[PDB]
């Protein structure tokens, strides 16, 4: 398309944005229909949006029947989601736009307070020091729609970050123009890159301002791929030796238990035959590594961080089960930053949510870097549409973000869980 200076109003009159804003919102308002427009008109309001950017995060990682339970049974928050969806569909950008992302500390994996804890107006070099290690380089997912904010009325003073970025031409928007602010909303799924950080001061109080590219993760969520698999996996067998299939077949259908068990014990007693197996096993998972970066899930229960394995993000409180804050934020602090052993070999899939394991309520949102020792699952006799990734023994998982969600379970079911961003890292022989 034709070539055109970008969307930027930051160093203009906020009349100016205010103008542009009003048109955009009254064409784009006129591309909807009622249902739609009510859905996005209603995110000029905080606990609606609140709400709907939660529920919208909530359902990648909820299984696909609760899905369909939730559309069966004509779940309102859904169909708002969906319209949101389908509306931002109608329209899409003829030019860059430049502003200011929505994210939030938390988003950022930033569990520590930024400001003064008394004035909630002052950043020290420390803080900035810690957050630039915390997020420089780091790829960090808005699973929520994501706001640009398009002049510096955007800013929101109680947020100590401000994240800019650029939003290529070609992508969906639409535009809101409520009291002073002026806005892009975009897609779900969006991720930022942030690739400076550095201290502002705007009316005696301190910002980091981060400079981020926009970027997006291979990330199916619930649904996995079917394609994936087949794509970069639908040669795997008939690249293997016949050793190498039959000790990784036989870990699949009958090993997996002793030897996951043999690993896990740090492989004492010895055991010659159980060794052999493992050393075919790692070979045949680095016949084709994972051969482009990608996001997997692992759901777990409480045992890998030392908690019980019926351990609730819940609490009893005047009748209704709510989400216990305490407990999300000692389990958020205490984590945040750990790594995760994994002596045996780790299972993993396209999948966020198999429905076998809705209850598993810590769900490892793992990025495999290009090269990983694994291997898509495919073709297998019984794993008929499990998407799995299993990964070498002595795969570990570095944490580096904890987003507390509210899974849906099935019809009259919800859950507090938590997704756990955790980078792949392999310290490896074999
Ligand atoms: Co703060």
Redesign the pocket.
Known sequence: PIIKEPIDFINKPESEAKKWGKEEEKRWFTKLNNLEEVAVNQLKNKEYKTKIDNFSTDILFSSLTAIEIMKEDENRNLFDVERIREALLKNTLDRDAIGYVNFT?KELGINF???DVEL?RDISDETLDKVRQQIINQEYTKFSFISLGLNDNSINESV?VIVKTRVPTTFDYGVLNDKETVSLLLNQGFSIIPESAIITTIKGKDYILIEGSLSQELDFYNKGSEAWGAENYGDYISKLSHEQLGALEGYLHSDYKAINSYLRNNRVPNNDELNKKIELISSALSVKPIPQTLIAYRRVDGIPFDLPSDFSFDKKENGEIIADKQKLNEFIDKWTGKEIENLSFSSTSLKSTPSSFSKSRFIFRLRLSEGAIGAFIYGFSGFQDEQEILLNKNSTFKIFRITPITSIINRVTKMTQVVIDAEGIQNKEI
């Open positions: 500390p307070s930024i400001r909630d100590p």
